Ligand binder design. Structure first.
Ligand SMILES: NS(=O)(=O)c1nc2ccccc2[nH]1
Length: 167
C-alpha cells in the first residue's frame, strides 16, 4: 500500500490519472518521479520545464553539473539525479523526439529504464511536445514496464481518449 490516490488501474502494474505531474509530485513526494528529458538535460518546456520550475531551477543547476562531467545522455537512455522538493529521486528519461526525426522504435528502450525502479510517478514518454502518438506511448508502456508505474496525464481530453481506447 502506497500514497497514490485516485488512479484508474489499466493492468497488473500500470495506473493512470488526469493530473498535472508537477502537482502530483509536490503532494505525493514519491520515491521516483520521471522527467521527460532531452539528451542535454535542458529543461525548457513540457514536463521538464514544469518540473524544473517547481524546483526553483535547482534541477537545471544539478543537470548542468551532470552534463559537464558526463556528457549528454543517449536517446532511449536515463540518469538518476535528485528529486529536490518533488521526490526522493528524479529519473531523467529520454524518449525519442519525433519533431527532431528520432526513431520512434527507441520509445521501448526509453521505457525499459523504468524497470530499474519498483514504483514510479511518470508522464507518457515522447508525448506532448515530443510529438509521438500518446495512444502508442501508453501501449509501449504497458507492453514494456513490469514495475509499478503511476501515469499522470495533464490533458483531460487526452486522458479520456487514452482510457476509452485502451485495449
Ligand atoms: N501547469 S505547469 O506546471 O505549468 C505544466 N506544464 C506542463 C507541461 C507538460 C506536462 C505537465 C505540465 N505542467
Amino acid at each position: 500500500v502506497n500514497s497514490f490516490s485516485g488512479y484508474l488501474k489499466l493492468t497488473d502494474n500500470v495506473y493512470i490519472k488526469n493530473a498535472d505531474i508537477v502537482e502530483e509530485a509536490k503532494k505525493v513526494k514519491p520515491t521516483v518521479v520521471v522527467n521527460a528529458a532531452n539528451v542535454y538535460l535542458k529543461h525548457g518546456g513540457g514536463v521538464a520545464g514544469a518540473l524544473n520550475k517547481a524546483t526553483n531551477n535547482a534541477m537545471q543547476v544539478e543537470s548542468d553539473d551532470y552534463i559537464a562531467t558526463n556528457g549528454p545522455l543517449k536517446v532511449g537512455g536515463s540518469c538518476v539525479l535528485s528529486g529536490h522538493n518533488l521526490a526522493k529521486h528524479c529519473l531523467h528519461v529520454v524518449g525519442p523526439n519525433v519533431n527532431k526525426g528520432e526513431d520512434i522504435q527507441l520509445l521501448k528502450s526509453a521505457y525499459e529504464n523504468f524497470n530499474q525502479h519498483e514504483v514510479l510517478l511518470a508522464p507518457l514518454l515522447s508525448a506532448g511536445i515530443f510529438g509521438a502518438d500518446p495512444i502508442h506511448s501508453l501501449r509501449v508502456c504497458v507492453d514494456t514496464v513490469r514495475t509499478n508505474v503511476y501515469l499522470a496525464v495533464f490533458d483531460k481530453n487526452l486522458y479520456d481518449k487514452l482510457v476509452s481506447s485502451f485495449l
